[model samples]
Target: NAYFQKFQLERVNLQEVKRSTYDHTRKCTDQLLLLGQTDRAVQLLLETSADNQHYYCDSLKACLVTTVTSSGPSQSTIKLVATNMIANGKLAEGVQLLCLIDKAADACRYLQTYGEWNRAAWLAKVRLNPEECADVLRRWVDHL
Candidate 1:
């Protein structure tokens, strides 16, 4: 119960580690991710991994999977993180995040900018209307 409440007080706990060192922040980020507190996880991941693009993008991949496959982080968090991804020049990931929040057409269109045809096909077929899917696929083949 105490652990649960502490988890509930996530913003406090999240900030608590900020007063500590990066190692501590990393550990706490790991714990949060393990416990499915992904909004906080992404926040810490971005904070600590800011200068380390490899780790930042790697952790964001897992965070994305968590958001898409299971459940965590509301639409607001998804939008925020997606914006971060776009700002960081990770267009494909931002597109994925957009899909998570029910922006299939926009996501599909953006994916084409990155030539992420496979991903665009999947997104179109899975989430878009039939006509839209046909259009996206046709566009993909034209690029090939």
Candidate 2:
């Protein structure tokens, strides 16, 4: 997370592999995490961390799926996100995201395809979202 810390400590934006420098006027890293950019946040952390520290590369988003603060992600933030989405007239995605993460399968709908749903279900083989994995087994019968 050095890149993040560097940005915070010095207000500098890091190179995005293209290796160009840019002014850090409005930092969006925190916003990225808030707007469900956990994967990208974790990706930044992974990039800054020693490449050999493989174990540190686990899913911080999955961890954020429950806990609040640095020790964990703020579950209450879900309400904030939903509220923002509702106010912005785009609540469907945020609502579905919260529901899907909350393990309430009945709340999940509008998946464009079985493969998309299956991928989500397949990756969610953990206690955080048990519902996501339920139908995955029956659906990925061939993959087994």
Candidate 3:
């Protein structure tokens, strides 16, 4: 946990960046994951979304995605992180992880619960079968 403390000290000043600093962001995320801090890792990624840099965070996101999907360790970390992401209002990001973990239905449900009718319907259309997609779309229509 001292590394986390050190990482905080080493990271770019939020007052200076007001968004993100990619290199430090990546390092902090890596360090968080090493400590089994998936929630913090995902939160770091979410906070860094405003970083001027591109692709680096994408790689980090993919790293966690791959970590969840591959048949190696249990996926509780990623799952918990994704759930926290949704509960904390990272709808699209959380849905991304949920879809990856074959929980697209749950993702759509959250989207709908949050009044993202278009996102819910669109996501279902993209990730689920036609039958399920149409079902979701119908619910949106009924809501209207």
Candidate 4:
């Protein structure tokens, strides 16, 4: 019982630390972007990247690209970051970010529904219905 309790405590602590780290990194990236310091944001992301390097680094790079290439912020950057967050096991944060993007795009309801469907598709893939992947996504959009 003691071992199980300790394990649970460790899990909680780890999750909290991960959540805090992700939030701090995201805030820094957003602030840098807002200040037109895209390069700094990229560097900060790279330095902060550890366990979730691929997702975190790529997400920041996506932001930099959008900031540099567009006259204003684009949904593409947000989508990329949200996708990366999901890939990094930050599903709730990813969905929250997606919702923010959706709100900005005036498609909040649709994206919320789509987020649920996307999660279901991910689950299906994990459940060994890889072949049904396309169909699952198709159904999601079709229902929308």
User: Which residue pairs come into collision in candidate 1?
Assistant: none
| TM-score of predicted structure 2 | 0.26
The 10-residue segment of model 3 with minimum total lDDT is 8-17
Candidate 3: lDDT over CA atoms? 0.62
Ranking by lDDT: 3, 1, 4, 2
lDDT of 1 by residue, 1-66 (tens): 345445445764656547577656655654454334556455656554446646756575556655
The lDDT, on a scale of 0 to 1, for candidate 4 is: 0.48
Candidate 1 off by > 4 Å: 1-84
TM-scores for all candidates: the values are: 0.41, 0.26, 0.52, 0.28
Residue 129 error, candidate 4, Å: 52
For each of the candidates, the C-alpha root-mean-square deviation to the true structure, in angstroms, is: 13.0, 13.5, 13.9, 13.8
With candidate 1 superimposed using the best TM-score fit, by how many Å does residue 46's alpha carbon deviate from the native?
Answer: 19
* Model 4 residue 15 lDDT score: 45
Question: Which one wins on TM-score?
Answer: 3
State candidate 1's TM-score: 0.41
Ranking by TM-score: 3, 1, 4, 2
What are the lDDT scores of the predictions, listed in order?
Answer: 0.62, 0.40, 0.62, 0.48
